[PDB]
Design a protein around this ligand. Structure first.
Ligand SMILES: Nc1ccn([C@@H]2O[C@H](COP(=O)(O)OP(=O)(O)OP(=O)(O)O)[C@@H](O)[C@H]2O)c(=O)n1
Ligand SMILES: Nc1ccn([C@@H]2O[C@H](COP(=O)(O)OP(=O)(O)OP(=O)(O)O)[C@@H](O)[C@H]2O)c(=O)n1
Ligand SMILES: [Cl-]
Ligand SMILES: [Cl-]
Ligand SMILES: [Cl-]
Ligand SMILES: [Cl-]
Ligand SMILES: [Cl-]
Ligand SMILES: [Cl-]
Ligand SMILES: [Cl-]
Ligand SMILES: [Cl-]
Lengths: 201, 202
């Protein structure tokens, strides 16, 4: 098993590669992971090494956000394992060697929850995200036909841009379809911003 | 500690939110995490639950890439903990509730390694990335002045775009400086592509 370690006994590593400026150490970001820890617990135990200088204490290998989130959530302890064979490169590995769910995969998860009758509000809570994040992904579950093609072929991949394109389609469907019908037309945050403006003239 | 669990006792969860199409299940991606596992081990133990249907066996809560990477690396076992109180939402949490190092933070780590005399090739290996990835970040350690400002103020944040902007600066420094001196000028993959082309005519 993992050990439940008193937070009082744990120090952050001052040479960790994540610096103070990192978005992930913003109060909002710690609050976000913190809420999931309050609800579900830390699900991936942190890695610590024994402090050689102060026996009985531990230094974080990986897990500073889980640690700060645990404090935010009012936890007295955190699940952890001891690994004294952990180096600075491993800390960068922990962070770089991982891959996200796609927007489609997130939408489809939301879809399966909606199909079971769960409210958007509760779907937000159980994954620790905002209602606006749910809304943006839900858009992908019922895309207009031409926009769906562009999304599936990979001609546009960013959920925010897809949403902006749908919002335009609702107000002016013929004009957006003719813009997509051009093969030279790339789809970026920028080109869509240009399309929105063209349509308000 | 974590248990070293026989890979033969572990099955993937067929309702995991990562699907077959996901870039992270590509052979190249499994090879990438696999190399780090071959060298360093799995450093974050996977989470499994007991299979109720098949006693003695386990289903993956989180850890399918670590699992496949372990197989790629020729491992017979994988570090794991048992959590029988794990649901489908937790699987999406494991993945969405995490934040990257910035490009600056990655460059500066590389910087610290270079300053100790480590070669680029060994820095690539120890973080499981390609030489080209190292190169693109190393660019950030010696940015021309005006590009540095734009990078630091957040006017451009993407490492790829910064590299493209440096490469343009090398060939036409006066013209790139005057392009950055315009406040209306946004800096995107697109605008820089437009700048590259404008310069290849003159
Ligand atoms: N030698 C390594 C390299 C990476 N990792 C960890 O492996 C995880 C990979 O995350 P992800 O890409 O999301 O894949 P898995 O969670 O393993 O698989 P899945 O999300 O499909 O369940 C990260 O926590 C990373 O720190 C590790 O434990 N040891
Ligand atoms: N309820 C939660 C929410 C998230 N996580 C895990 O917390 C980690 C967050 O990773 P990251 O953003 O990189 O932060 P930490 O690794 O905790 O901190 P650091 O990288 O700064 O050492 C991920 O493995 C995620 O799956 C968890 O164990 N339990
Ligand atoms: Cl710092
Ligand atoms: Cl507690
Ligand atoms: Cl990714
Ligand atoms: Cl339609
Ligand atoms: Cl699948
Ligand atoms: Cl082994
Ligand atoms: Cl991130
Ligand atoms: Cl200069």
């Amino acid at each position: 098993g993992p050990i439940e370690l008193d937070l009082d006994l744990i120090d952050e590593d001052p040479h960790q590669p994540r610096t103070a400026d990192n978005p992930g150490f913003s109060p909002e970001s710690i609050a976000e992971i913190g809420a999931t820890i309050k609800e579900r617990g830390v699900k991936s135990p942190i890695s610590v090494r024994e402090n050689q200088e102060q026996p009985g204490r531990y230094i974080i290998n990986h897990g500073a956000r889980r640690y700060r989130g645990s404090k935010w959530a009012g936890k007295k302890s955190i699940p952890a394992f001891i690994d004294n064979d952990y180096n600075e490169a491993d800390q960068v590995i922990e962070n770089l060697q991982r891959n996200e769910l796609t927007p489609r995969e997130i939408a489809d998860f939301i879809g399966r929850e909606l199909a079971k009758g769960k409210k958007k509000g509760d779907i937000a809570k159980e994954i620790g995200k905002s209602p606006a994040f749910i809304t943006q992904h839900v858009t992908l579950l019922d895309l207009p036909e031409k926009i769906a093609d562009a999304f599936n072929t990979g001609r546009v991949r960013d959920v925010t841009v897809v949403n902006e394109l749908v919002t335009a389609f609702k107000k002016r469907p013929e004009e957006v379809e003719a813009w997509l019908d051009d093969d030279t037309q790339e789809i970026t945050r920028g080109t869509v911003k240009l399309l929105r403006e063209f349509l308000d003239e």
